[PDB]
Design a protein around this ligand. Structure first.
Ligand code: HEM
Ligand code: HEM
Ligand SMILES: O=[N+]([O-])c1cccc2c(Br)n[nH]c12
Ligand SMILES: O=[N+]([O-])c1cccc2c(Br)n[nH]c12
Ligand SMILES: O=[N+]([O-])c1cccc2c(Br)n[nH]c12
Ligand SMILES: O=[N+]([O-])c1cccc2c(Br)n[nH]c12
Ligand SMILES: [Zn+2]
Lengths: 414, 416
């Protein structure tokens, strides 16, 4: 049952015993592996048609409290058995329960620590948790968010942070942030099917316009937020320009690069995922850290269904775009990633390259093997989009499983 | 909707369902509890030498599945020729404990094994494979004659042709036909006194086995190894490939003049020879197959892997790059130029080669051809996406379902 895990660069071997703690099922079976699938339908977080079984919830709850008390080394103590009873009496009576701030802080950190697709988990212990459970309006969500952004950005010296809004309650709508990230660029479906801006944001941009936003016409127009309080229509909120930090891209040696007019924001804040802690679900819990240069230079700027600048850059570099064997694509992508690192470093904004990032992840995997006897990792996401085998994680076998607390995907609110 | 794995292509936003996986009769390493898809050698396709024949009934079920597959491919499923063949296989297994394949059946199974290989990006060529029947072979000496013939035909002076040579199957109460080498062409790995390794670090053991068996070792970085061929119940015999049969390509860069001075080179023919070909339950322990190289395999893996030649730093220093800081992306720049050299050099020498962009584009075409043909295609994402410029190829944006279908090429324990 326990996986023999091997690193092919070093020849070392380890056994993942942490996978035995996984209580949630993934999409794979012995007949076929679906590890490469981006999204689920089974691992998804289905709405509350009513309160989920008290036994099931109480089981996840007790396990979390147990995890919390081990965390502070006061396991088995009186403080522990009293807390387990509080949780049980509360579920038995109301069908749900509530967490203490310190449990929520522990839970939030464990959620990040448990995320298999995150290559930045070495930073898991340093996370600023903002308790925004004292929120009752879209207006209040906005204030909290602005404060999250101000703190997280920190003049360019980024700090990891998460804001937790009210949990889901049975028989009531969810608190939701309609945007996938707090900061994203608009995607305008310009007449001929083409899209000015980020093609991945066509739908959300249309929804913003539908809710009163007067749109722009640039390639990098920061989008407004659609915040939604329970059973209420989403409200539109324009983020103050002084709050959104952006880095204009330029190349260290290629003078003409800057003329491309490219730029990217400093803060990567995912705001569409569900945070699950002890059976409870927080539908609104935006989190942020800092960028790995490849997400910007490779994925966001070079993906075919995204900005797709690969060719424009290759033409400017005067590369042989006629044939694939000239490797014009590979050369252009490397220069774009270098431009991102140069630009962010020049602007004094936090950034980390894929080589440094994966090296740190290897250290993290080692820390975790010692600490918990394994570490859930999703190979396809941990290995960077360019230069895969050039990094240490490529040659490292990994085991992927679901551990709780956990960040999960959830249905779009519309 | 449909009760099958839903697969999405994120670049195009298109959806497909894999119904072919339903026909998988063999389990992989994953369970709903955890995914072990990233593991290289899972104990699944692994075939530990069964002392005797397969259970008459287990072999029988596998045999029946293959015969059905065969008749279905020639469009005679349910016919008298089909039912007669099924009876003939059962009768043969009932009296002898095993059975034998008709020539066309062997050709079909061999092509299907390639078609079914999850990790092969070059499967769009599956239909055009030359199958050499070597089931008459009876000595290590003859295995060598057959291999040299394969190498000659397959190499074809630089205009490579896919081919597989099938030696006699595993037999009850009779040793196996084995090729000790991992590939027909491999460079030697010499363990230095100082601990280092000259040549290919990956080939240290086979090199030492060659020496233990009479090989007089050289001491270069690119010394082609001799073959250790093994016939039934005999010790392996050493056979040196005549130099003129092993085509090699001196590597040079199209603009960086100094690259040629590095003295780097690579052989033109990739021929895997340590895998077991399984068809209808019959095992062909010796069945070397070859095709042609995808540039990344040479320039990125073979030449740049830290546990292989590891030439990244040397090329970086030559390009005068900052190898003291990761942010200079010195590794990336060098690897790109190393891959361009492999492509430029093979094209210059008139030897078949395919860049990772052209290969993945063609695999996308293969995926479409197989959706319509079989209703899905077993693919191992981690092995299909190139070791460099991953998201720049169309396969990165294509979800994939991985499973084991038979006939198949499986891993098997080293003979020693
Ligand atoms: C410290 C800096 C960080 C870096 C450099 C980093 C980098 C990455 C990268 C490259 C990915 C893979 C691509 C993707 O899924 O979009 C990822 C995924 C992820 N990270 Fe991190 N991360 C960081 C901080 C954080 C923080 C603060 C959290 C949560 C508290 C977090 C949670 C996750 C999760 C849940 C995913 C998966 C998202 C999905 O499934 O789409 N990360 N991270
Ligand atoms: C025609 C050109 C071909 C190309 C460009 C090609 C390319 C590749 C590549 C890149 C791999 C991935 C690396 C690896 O797994 O070792 C691979 C794997 C494989 N190919 Fe192909 N291939 C070709 C021909 C063939 C042929 C002719 C056969 C068999 C008849 C074959 C059988 C396989 C198998 C079984 C593997 C898996 C090896 C493993 O388990 O590691 N391939 N191929
Ligand atoms: O840097 N990244 O590539 C990246 C991807 C996805 C999420 C995050 C967060 Br939250 N910080 N950085 C991230
Ligand atoms: O070493 N690994 O752990 C590993 C995982 C997944 C794919 C590959 C390839 Br292709 N080489 N090594 C790999
Ligand atoms: O080109 N390749 O990278 C490659 C890898 C593994 C096996 C083969 C064969 Br057989 N032809 N090409 C191959
Ligand atoms: O699109 N995909 O099929 C797919 C599979 C596995 C990983 C990724 C990433 Br990271 N982006 N797209 C992916
Ligand atoms: Zn799997």
């Amino acid at each position: 049952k326990f996986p023999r895990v091997k690193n092919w660069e070093l020849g070392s071997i380890t056994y993942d015993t942490l996978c035995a703690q996984s209580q949630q099922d993934g999409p794979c079976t012995p007949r076929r592996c679906l590890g490469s699938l981006v999204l689920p339908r089974k691992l998804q977080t289905r709405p509350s048609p009513g309160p989920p079984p008290a036994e099931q919830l109480l089981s996840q709850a007790r396990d979390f409290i147990n995890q919390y008390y081990s965390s502070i080394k006061r396991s088995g103590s009186q403080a522990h058995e009293e807390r387990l009873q509080e949780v049980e009496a509360e579920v038995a009576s109301t069908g749900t329960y509530h967490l203490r701030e310190s449990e929520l802080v522990f839970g939030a950190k464990q959620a990040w620590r448990n995320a298999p697709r995150c290559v930045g988990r070495i930073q898991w212990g340093k996370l600023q948790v903002f308790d925004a459970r004292d929120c009752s309006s879209a207006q209040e969500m906005f204030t909290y968010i602005c404060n999250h952004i101000k703190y997280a950005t920190n003049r360019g010296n980024l700090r990891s942070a998460i804001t937790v809004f009210p949990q889901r309650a049975p028989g009531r709508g969810d608190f939701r942030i309609w945007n996938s990230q707090l900061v994203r660029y608009a995607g305008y479906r310009q007449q001929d099917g083409s899209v000015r801006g980020d093609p991945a944001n066509v739908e959300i941009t249309e929804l913003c316009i539908q809710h009163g936003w007067t749109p722009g016409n640039g390639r990098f127009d920061v989008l407004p937020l659609l915040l939604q309080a329970p059973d209420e229509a989403p409200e539109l909120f324009v983020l103050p320009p002084e709050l959104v930090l952006e880095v204009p891209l330029e190349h260290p040696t290629l003078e003409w690069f800057a003329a491309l007019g490219l730029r990217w924001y400093a803060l990567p804040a995912v705001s569409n995922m569900l945070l699950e802690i002890g059976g409870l679900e927080f539908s609104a819990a935006p989190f942020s850290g800092w960028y790995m240069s490849t997400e910007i230079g490779t994925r966001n700027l070079c993906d075919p269904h995204r900005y797709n600048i690969l060719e424009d850059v290759a033409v400017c570099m005067d590369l042989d775009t006629r044939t694939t064997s000239s490797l014009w694509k590979d050369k252009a992508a490397v220069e774009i990633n270098l431009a991102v690192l140069h630009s962010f470093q020049l602007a004094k904004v936090t950034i980390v390259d894929h080589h440094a990032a994966t090296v740190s992840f290897m250290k993290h995997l080692d820390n975790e093997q010692k600490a918990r006897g394994g570490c859930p990792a999703d190979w396809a996401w941990i290995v960077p989009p360019i230069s895969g085998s050039l990094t240490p994680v490529f040659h490292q076998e990994m085991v992927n499983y679901i551990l709780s607390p956990a960040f999960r995907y959830q249905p779009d609110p519309w």
